[PDB]
Amino acid sequence: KEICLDHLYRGCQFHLPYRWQLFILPTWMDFQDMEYIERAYCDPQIEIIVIEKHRINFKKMTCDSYPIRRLSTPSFVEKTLNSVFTTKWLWYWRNELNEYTQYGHESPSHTSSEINSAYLESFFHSCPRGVLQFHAGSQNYELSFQGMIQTNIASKTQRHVVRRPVFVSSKDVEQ
Amino acid sequence: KEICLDHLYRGCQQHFHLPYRWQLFILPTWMDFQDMEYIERAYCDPQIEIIVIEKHRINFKKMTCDSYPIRRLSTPSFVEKTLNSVFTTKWLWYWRNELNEYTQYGHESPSHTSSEINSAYLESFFHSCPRGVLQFHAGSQNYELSFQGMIQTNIASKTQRHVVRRPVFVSSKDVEQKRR
Numbered sequence: 001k002e003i004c005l006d007h008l009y010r011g012c013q014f015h016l017p018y019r020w021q022l023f024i025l026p027t028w029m030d031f032q033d034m035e036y037i038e039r040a041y042c043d044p045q046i047e048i049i050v051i052e053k054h055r056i057n058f059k060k061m062t063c064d065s066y067p068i069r070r071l072s073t074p075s076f077v078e079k080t081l082n083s084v085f086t087t088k089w090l091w092y093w094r095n096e097l098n099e100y101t102q103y104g105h106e107s108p109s110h111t112s113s114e115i116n117s118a119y120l121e122s123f124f125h126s127c128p129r130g131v132l133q134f135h136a137g138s139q140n141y142e143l144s145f146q147g148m149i150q151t152n153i154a155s156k157t158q159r160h161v162v163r164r165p166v167f168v169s170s171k172d173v174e175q
Numbered sequence: 176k177e178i179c180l181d182h183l184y185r186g187c188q189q190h191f192h193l194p195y196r197w198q199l200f201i202l203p204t205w206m207d208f209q210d211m212e213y214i215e216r217a218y219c220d221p222q223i224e225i226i227v228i229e230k231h232r233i234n235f236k237k238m239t240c241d242s243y244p245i246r247r248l249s250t251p252s253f254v255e256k257t258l259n260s261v262f263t264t265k266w267l268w269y270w271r272n273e274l275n276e277y278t279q280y281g282h283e284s285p286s287h288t289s290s291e292i293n294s295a296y297l298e299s300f301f302h303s304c305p306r307g308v309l310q311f312h313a314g315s316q317n318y319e320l321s322f323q324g325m326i327q328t329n330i331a332s333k334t335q336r337h338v339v340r341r342p343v344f345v346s347s348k349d350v351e352q353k354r355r
């Protein structure tokens with residue numbers, strides 16, 4: 001496990017000090033002309049640059065409305081640890097009993113998403129500004145990480161999303 | 176250089192006996208909460224927003240304690256592979272001046288005033304505490320900088336100015352020369 005940090009010190013999964021990429025679900029793809037993008041970015045007056053008719057917006061960190069990132073090159077290598085010390089994040093949604101159901105688990109109406117906590121944490125880690133589509137029972141939904149809502153794409157009703165860890169006690173650690 | 180990631184995958188300059196470390200920011204340092212296992216237990220219940228730990232009202236929804244930012248460090252540590260410093264990004268901090276141009280923090284305004292604080296000072300604070308509000312002096316005036324709003328505000332006149340953070344430009348030519 002090797003990580004680098006993006007422009008806001010976020011942990012991410014090179015011959016220049018910088019790597020410019022845009023997120024077209026499912027992948028972060030390299031820009032061509034990385035040195036030219038960087039030169040524009042190093043000028044604080046510049047918010048808009050267009051290369052190949054792709055409109056980059058440094059204020060929103062978007063290109064044609066897709067998220068972009070600047071990876072800093074310096075790499076960090078994970079220290080070998082017991083997996084009991086790794087945080088697992090669980091994702092929940094506010095159900096019709098106004099209680100929390102874990103994603104991939106059955107609702108009070110015996111409906112479940114295919115997506116689960118592992119799926120959502122992986123996506124959230126890679127792309128926090130990600131809006132994504134998913135199915136549950138007979139319905140289609142849109143999940144926004146930024147708003148922490150899911151929305152039925154037909155009825156437009158929103159439900160609240162929450163992200164909290166699996167509890168690991170000091171007893172669990174010794175065990 | 177060894178780092179941990181917080182609850183939002185942010186790199187933090189640092190393993191610890193628990194898988195989690197709960198801290199609050201008392202300017203200018205991150206301090207350990209007492210009763211970390213009890214905070215974590217409450218946090219792992221998604222219905223819990225508010226707890227009291229001794230004197231402290233902790234708010235998981237805002238990730239604040241008595242209005243100070245809090246963070247949860249994940250314990251897995253990452254050790255930086257030492258490289259040529261030409262591969263490290265240097266961040267410059269600017270403010271929009273009265274000629275509607277950018278002055279670097281610590282450099283002269285069009286009115287011959289300068290902040291004490293500079294790009295190194297701001298990048299260090301921003302890295303440690305992005306939800307930080309900072310007080311600073313420039314000429315005879317007192318200011319507040321909000322990282323979240325990317326604004327400075329004269330605390331007397333309430334005049335706001337826009338803040339921008341962009342790198343020192345390093346070309347592929349610069350890279351080749353910097354390998355002695």
Ligand SMILES: Nc1ncnc2c1ncn2[C@@H]1O[C@H](COP(=O)(O)OP(=O)(O)OP(=O)(O)O)[C@@H](O)[C@H]1O
Pocket residue numbers: 093095096103104105106107108109111112113136137139150152155156157159
């Ligand atoms: N992520 C999910 N996983 C499983 N079931 C879900 C999920 N989201 C919603 N549901 C189920 O869908 C129903 C909630 O409806 P939904 O959010 O699709 O909007 P709606 O049709 O406008 O409102 P409602 O279905 O309450 O009349 C409930 O049966 C709920 O349990």
Ligand SMILES: Nc1ncnc2c1ncn2[C@@H]1O[C@H](COP(=O)(O)OP(=O)(O)OP(=O)(O)O)[C@@H](O)[C@H]1O
Pocket residue numbers: 270272273280281282283284285286288289290313314316327329332333334335336
């Ligand atoms: N970070 C800074 N570093 C140096 N000088 C600064 C800085 N911020 C503001 N100044 C200077 O302070 C002077 C007054 O601007 P300031 O933002 O303090 O608000 P102000 O007194 O309300 O100004 P005005 O009334 O002219 O709008 C200007 O010359 C400006 O260049």
